[PDB]
Swiss-Prot record:
It comes from Bacillus cereus (strain ATCC 14579 / DSM 31 / CCUG 7414 / JCM 2152 / NBRC 15305 / NCIMB 9373 / NCTC 2599 / NRRL B-3711). Keywords: Cytoplasm, Isomerase, Manganese, Metal-binding. This is Phosphopentomutase. GO terms for molecular function: magnesium ion binding; manganese ion binding; phosphopentomutase activity. PANTHER family: PHOSPHOPENTOMUTASE. Mn(2+) 1 binds at D12, D326, H327. Transmembrane segments: none annotated.
Length: 391
């Protein structure tokens, strides 16, 4: 093998400008990093600059360098969707024709009626809301009627909330399994069905740790699947394991923030393993992208960049670092959904003694999976062109 360990970092939603097909998604003028850089009056990311982020595209405070540490380019998404599942599944060697849906006006009547008819329970709510806001509004009604609080977020989820003393956990889990079967439908395909049990009284409701997720498996066997079957290590950090529904994962590390995510990346650098370490930094998307907060987004990027020098110091000669994104989420853009954007790609190894160069534009996210697969000599994915030999 050329590289013993590959460390892949997904900076979630950190796009680098509108894709060629952005108009179809209503995403013209979208530019995640660029608008953040403009808002911040110059983004302070000297370590990403040294890798060659500005060499991909120059933005305010992000300039190009003569000798970048590693190789640089951007990737174009080939799959139909701009959601998290689609992005991550493509990265690992798949092509997804059927996009996952978001529901800013609530779920369609047809789906809710069929869920009512199958469960024998009424449905209240049907709108985007946080866990705290929806329980204060409809929690008391739920307790008194025995109905189900169905709600969503800015992402592709269907959440069902019910009181543990009123609706038993096992009954709530069975309802979510039915909801999962009904949402395996093109008209209303959700990425994740989430059980949201809660306890307490009107005025003081609290969500219990009895939360259960019901996700879909990737539409095809991934490079992660092939690595695991060939006895390689596949360490998932953050929400990576959940996104792939555990497929191809040998070990999973839970994180609570971006800084905690970088701590667990440092933990894997200290581990004697052979294979892939896979990190997702979710804060960019969940906290700032969807909430349209360019200031908080900007600060988070600067906080992330300041952690990189320690990562550079720990990388060995046979280690490869890959930094990318799964889609865009422009914090200065209409609505609450993601943006169809190019994603940056940086590939760095300390063994690159004379630095890196420009790679050809990656026509699919699957080029990463193809590179990972060729490196470890496992079955090549159906989609993607490896850039291993260019490095
Ligand atoms: O808790 P996570 O990170 O798994 O987040 C989970 O629930 C969130 C709701 O947030 P809230 O609690 O404010 O309603 C969703 O947006 C997200 O898709 C889901 O993975
Ligand atoms: Mn848009
Ligand atoms: Mn994402
Ligand atoms: Mn999102």
């Amino acid at each position: 093998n050329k590289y013993k360990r590959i460390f892949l970092v997904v900076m979630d939603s950190v796009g680098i400008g509108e894709a060629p097909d952005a108009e179809q998604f209503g995403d013209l003028g979208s530019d995640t990093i660029g608008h953040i850089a403009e808002h911040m009056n110059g983004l302070q990311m000297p370590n990403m600059v040294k890798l060659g982020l500005g060499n991909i595209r120059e933005m305010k405070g992000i300039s190009k360098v003569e000798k970048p540490l590693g190789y640089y380019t951007k990737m174009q998404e080939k799959s139909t969707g701009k959601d998290t599942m689609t992005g991550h599944w493509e990265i690992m060697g798949l092509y997804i024709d059927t996009p996952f849906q978001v529901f800013p006006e609530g779920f369609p009547k047809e789906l809710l009626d069929e869920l009512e008819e199958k469960t024998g329970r009424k449905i209240i709510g049907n709108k985007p809301a946080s866990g705290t806001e929806i329980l204060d509004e409809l929690g008391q009604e739920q307790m008194e009627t025995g109905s189900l609080i169905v709600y969503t977020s800015a992402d592709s989820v269907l959440q069902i909330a019910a009181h543990e003393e009123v609706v038993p956990l096992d009954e709530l889990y069975k309802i979510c399994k039915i909801a999962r079967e009904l949402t395996l439908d093109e008209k209303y395909m959700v990425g994740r069905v989430i059980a949201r049990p809660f306890v307490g009284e009107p005025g003081n409701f609290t969500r219990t740790p009895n939360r259960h997720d019901y996700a879909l498996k990737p539409f095809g066997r991934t490079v992660m699947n092939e690595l695991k079957d060939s006895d390689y290590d596949v360490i998932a950090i953050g929400k990576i394991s959940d996104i792939y529904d555990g497929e191809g994962v040998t070990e999973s590390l839970r994180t609570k923030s971006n800084m905690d995510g970088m701590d667990k990346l440092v933990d894997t650098l200290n581990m004697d393993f052979t294979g892939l370490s896979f990190l997702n930094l979710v804060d960019f998307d969940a906290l700032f992208g969807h909430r349209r907060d360019p200031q908080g987004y900007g600060e988070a990027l600067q906080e992330y960049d300041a952690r990189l020098p320690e990562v550079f110091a720990k990388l060995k000669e046979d280690d490869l670092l890959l930094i990318t994104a799964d889609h865009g989420n422009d914090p200065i853009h209409p609505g609450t959904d993601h943006t169809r954007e190019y994603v940056p790609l940086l590939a760095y190894s300390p063994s690159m003694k004379e630095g890196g160069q420009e790679l050809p534009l990656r026509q699919t996210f699957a080029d990463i999976g193809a590179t990972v697969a060729e490196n470890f000599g496992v079955k090549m994915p159906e989609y993607g062109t490896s850039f291993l030999n260019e490095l």
